[PDB]
Design an enzyme around this catalytic site. Structure first.
Site, PDB file in Angstrom:
ATOM      1  N   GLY A 163       0.790  -1.221   0.000  1.00  0.00           N
ATOM      2  CA  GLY A 163       0.000   0.000   0.000  1.00  0.00           C
ATOM      3  C   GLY A 163       0.825   1.276   0.000  1.00  0.00           C
ATOM      4  O   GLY A 163       0.317   2.349  -0.351  1.00  0.00           O
ATOM      5  N   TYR A 170      -9.469  -0.401  -3.525  1.00  0.00           N
ATOM      6  CA  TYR A 170     -10.528  -0.229  -2.555  1.00  0.00           C
ATOM      7  C   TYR A 170     -11.841  -0.309  -3.304  1.00  0.00           C
ATOM      8  O   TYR A 170     -12.024   0.363  -4.323  1.00  0.00           O
ATOM      9  CB  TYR A 170     -10.429   1.137  -1.877  1.00  0.00           C
ATOM     10  N   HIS A 181      -6.579  11.495   8.574  1.00  0.00           N
ATOM     11  CA  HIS A 181      -5.207  11.009   8.699  1.00  0.00           C
ATOM     12  C   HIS A 181      -4.294  11.693   7.688  1.00  0.00           C
ATOM     13  O   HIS A 181      -4.766  12.326   6.749  1.00  0.00           O
ATOM     14  CB  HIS A 181      -5.179   9.503   8.407  1.00  0.00           C
ATOM     15  N   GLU A 183      -0.680  10.589   5.445  1.00  0.00           N
ATOM     16  CA  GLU A 183      -0.131   9.313   5.021  1.00  0.00           C
ATOM     17  C   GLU A 183       1.012   8.859   5.933  1.00  0.00           C
ATOM     18  O   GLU A 183       1.563   9.665   6.690  1.00  0.00           O
ATOM     19  CB  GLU A 183       0.378   9.425   3.594  1.00  0.00           C
ATOM     20  N   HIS A 269      -6.721  14.493   5.643  1.00  0.00           N
ATOM     21  CA  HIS A 269      -7.891  14.306   4.799  1.00  0.00           C
ATOM     22  C   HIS A 269      -8.742  13.153   5.273  1.00  0.00           C
ATOM     23  O   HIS A 269      -8.282  12.274   6.007  1.00  0.00           O
ATOM     24  CB  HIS A 269      -7.483  14.066   3.348  1.00  0.00           C
ATOM     25  N   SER A 281      -4.597   3.229  -5.319  1.00  0.00           N
ATOM     26  CA  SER A 281      -3.679   4.223  -4.770  1.00  0.00           C
ATOM     27  C   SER A 281      -2.378   3.647  -4.209  1.00  0.00           C
ATOM     28  O   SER A 281      -2.242   2.442  -3.983  1.00  0.00           O
ATOM     29  CB  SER A 281      -4.387   5.033  -3.665  1.00  0.00           C
TER      30      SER A 281
END
Ligand SMILES: CN(C)NC(=O)CCC(=O)O
Ligand SMILES: CN(C)NC(=O)CCC(=O)O
Ligand SMILES: [Cl-]
Ligand code: NI
Ligand SMILES: [Zn+2]
EC number: 1.14.11.66
Length: 348
Positions: A163, A170, A181, A183, A269, A281
């Site tokens: 990831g 997703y 959160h 990244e 975000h 992603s």
């Protein structure tokens, strides 16, 4: 540039689209990083896949049922792992009258229904599924191989982090959320919506990030007390009305099928999916990211939490600071408004 720090949308020409790192440098020269989030619509003529019709067999090894508890705009999301299921099984659950999108006329309405009903009828999110939907020959913005300096982790230690330097998929359904959160290691991230209903996003400018953290710490003292980075547990939901009430700046934007969303270092975000959809992603970096990497506050309470060794980056990109940094005396203060160095040529 971009003094209001609002989410910007870009429309690269095919010529512009081809060099990924170069375009990221470009939007930053335009101030796109200030909002912590930016949308990139690809040239009409591009497509990462011929059709999305053979994947009904893809297995989603670990679907998650999202139970949410809370009131007055403050919530905590608990994931419950369900047994593996394939896409087919998911789409049907998703489109069934029990879990499908409510009827609405405008986004403002769907948003209201989201925040009013997020604690009811917990949905399933086919999240974090290793893999990509890109065809092995697509060379533009291929999330499976962007070629940014983040490759330096795999390239020097053979370490891959699912990831992070590898693609995730997703599959969502109405009301599925991603909590507030930044990244891991406060890296960048790129998100591509392959198909289906929209995904709406909320973001807080990196420059106001600490303000969101103080707010969260204020509302969840116990959580704060036991982990110096509890928001990294990706379990905290806070509504736009609470953000507005406490003075935290934020912006919202809705991403549609075929559009990319880029999140910047230390950009908080969150958001939710409108209905059945699929997104892909991964994380990436630029030179501006290194300082963020070095100063990221990490989760102090779990195991297998993503921790990247900044050593090879400081060594190679900041050789003049290596010794000071190693000694714990590097006291650089990050200026969230500065674009990444690679942006020099668009600021001539
Ligand atoms: C990588 N990150 C920006 N992606 C997100 O936060 C969205 C994740 C999701 O779609 O649940
Ligand atoms: C070529 N692309 C990366 N950049 C642009 O098209 C913008 C150039 C500019 O700064 O006007
Ligand atoms: Cl608490
Ligand atoms: Ni994210
Ligand atoms: Zn923790």
């Amino acid at each position: 540039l971009n003094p209001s720090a609002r989410i910007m949308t870009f429309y690269p020409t095919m010529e512009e689209f081809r060099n990924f790192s170069r375009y990221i440098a470009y939007i930053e020269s335009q101030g796109a990083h200030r909002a912590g989030l930016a949308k990139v619509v690809p040239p009409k003529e591009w497509k990462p896949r011929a059709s999305y019709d053979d994947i009904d067999d893809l297995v989603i090894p670990a679907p998650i049922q999202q139970l949410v508890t809370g009131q007055s705009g403050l919530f905590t999301q608990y994931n419950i792992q369900k047994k593996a299921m394939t896409v087919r099984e998911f789409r049907k659950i998703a489109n069934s009258d029990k879990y499908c999108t409510p009827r609405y006329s405008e986004f403002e309405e769907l948003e209201r229904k989201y925040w009013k009903n997020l604690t009811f009828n917990p949905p399933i999110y086919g999240a974090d599924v290793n893999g990509t939907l890109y065809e092995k020959h697509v060379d533009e913005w291929n999330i499976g191989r962007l070629r940014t300096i983040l490759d330096l982790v795999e390239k020097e230690s053979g370490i891959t982090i699912e990831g992070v330097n590898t693609p995730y998929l997703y599959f969502g359904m109405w009301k599925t959320s991603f909590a507030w959160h930044t990244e891991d290691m406060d890296l960048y991230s790129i998100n591509y919506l392959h198909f289906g209903e929209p995904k709406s996003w909320y973001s807080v400018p990196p420059e106001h990030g600490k303000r969101l953290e103080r707010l969260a710490k204020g509302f969840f003292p116990g959580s704060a007390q036991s982990c110096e980075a509890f928001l990294r547990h990706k379990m905290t939901l806070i509504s736009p009305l609470m953000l507005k009430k406490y003075g935290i700046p934020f912006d919202k934007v809705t991403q549609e099928a075929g559009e990319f969303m880029i999140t910047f270092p230390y950009g908080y975000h969150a958001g939710f999916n409108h209905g059945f959809n699929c997104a892909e992603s991964t994380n990436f970096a630029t030179r501006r990211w290194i300082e963020y990497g070095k100063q990221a506050v990490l989760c102090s309470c779990r195991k297998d939490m993503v921790k990247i060794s900044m050593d090879v980056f400081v060594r190679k990109f900041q050789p003049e600071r290596y010794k000071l940094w190693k000694a714990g005396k590097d006291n650089t203060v990050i200026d969230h408004t500065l674009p990444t160095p690679e942006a020099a040529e668009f600021l001539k």
